[PDB]
């Protein structure tokens, strides 16, 4: 857990057990090429390697082999309009490796939209837009500037 005071361990004391944990992680697609078993996460700063091992081996039943973490420096170069710096936050990324020969590839979540429901609150206005655009674009270079509204 984070932002919670840990009970200090006198020697020979009970096991430190956290019940409703406070850590939220993000599986994230890598930015460079990684081997087939490396699974890149994005974890809070107050999380250790052994906490990520027990987190993935307690909640998701993922067999984990090795864990390596690092701290990423968020950029602090953007100025505001009053020249005070805007801080992109630091975060901690972690690369777990699956244990028993399992592999992993990050999915494609977005492809591919196949949808055409009835449209009233947005697509009736789109139908009005498109039908006005299909009708009214009949300009003529042979009229030379005259308005094409009068039947005369």
């Amino acid at each position: 857990a984070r932002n919670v005071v840990y009970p200090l361990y006198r020697l020979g004391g009970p096991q430190l057990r956290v019940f409703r944990t406070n850590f939220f992680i993000q599986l994230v697609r890598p930015g460079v090429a990684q081997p087939e078993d490396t699974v890149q996460f994005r974890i809070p700063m107050e999380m250790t390697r052994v906490d990520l091992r027990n987190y993935l081996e307690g909640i998701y039943n993922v067999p984990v082999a090795a864990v390596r973490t690092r701290v990423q420096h968020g950029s602090n170069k953007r100025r505001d309009h009053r020249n005070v710096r805007i801080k992109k936050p630091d975060y901690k990324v972690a690369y777990v490796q699956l244990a028993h020969g399992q592999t992993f590839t990050f999915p494609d979540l977005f492809p591919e939209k196949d949808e055409s429901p009835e449209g009233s609150a947005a697509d009736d206005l789109y139908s009005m837009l498109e039908e006005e655009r299909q009708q009214r674009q009949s300009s003529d270079p042979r009229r030379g500037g005259v308005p094409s509204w009068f039947g005369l």
């Binding site: 200090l8 006198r10 009970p14 019940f19 409703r20 006005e132 655009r133």
Partner: protein
């Protein structure tokens, strides 16, 4: 979602977090505040949905229905009544689709209308002795009910079907709470069969 606005920020017929709202008043901008009628949250009578009557403007006397209230400037927009015209689809080679847009009216310029004889009427917040709080007409003495308007959730209750991750109604209300002097920690530690037998020693807090 939860963004603090500048202390003198204009409210401008767009939602405050929109794209053209960030276009109109960016965080750089500082302009004169619009001094406005302070109105208590108990005396404000017209809500979003009831029929009203415009008293003055380009079209006085006609009735219509409000579609939005902007309480930070005492604004209402009646449906398609106090209108002007603007072209929506605009490019560098073509612009048409001239669509009417409404213009906001103050609460002083708008009167509520009773459904019995359909005239503009003054209102009083005559609280009912039978418990509830409702508006009451002054001149004719008829109760004006608050109209049913679809809520801001974007959802309707009656044709709602539970998804896979929506809990049922009967399991949302099942009382399993047996009140006891245990904490959650020792309760789930004895429910899960976990046994700890060694003691926590003395610790010095200062």
């Amino acid at each position: 979602s939860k963004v603090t606005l500048p202390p003198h920020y204009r409210y401008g017929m767009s939602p405050p977090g929109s794209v053209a709202d960030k276009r109109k008043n960016p965080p750089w901008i500082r302009r004169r505040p619009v001094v406005v009628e302070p109105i208590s949250d108990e005396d404000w009578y017209l809500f979003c949905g009831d029929t009203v009557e415009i008293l003055e403007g380009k079209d006085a006397g006609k009735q219509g229905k409000v579609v939005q209230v902007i309480r930070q400037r005492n604004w209402v927009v009646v449906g398609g009544l106090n209108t002007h015209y603007r072209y929506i689809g605009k490019t560098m080679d073509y612009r048409g689709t001239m669509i009417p847009s409404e213009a906001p009216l103050l609460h002083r310029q708008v009167k509520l209308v009773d459904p019995m004889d359909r005239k503009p009427t003054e209102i009083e917040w005559r609280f009912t002795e039978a418990g509830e709080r409702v508006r009451v007409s002054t001149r004719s003495g008829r109760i004006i009910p608050k109209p049913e308007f679809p809520r801001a959730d974007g959802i309707v209750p009656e044709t709602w079907i539970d998804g896979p991750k929506d809990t049922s109604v009967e399991d949302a209300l099942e009382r399993t709470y047996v009140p006891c002097l245990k904490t959650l920690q020792e309760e789930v530690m004895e429910a899960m069969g976990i046994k700890e037998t060694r003691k926590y020693k003395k610790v010095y807090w200062y």
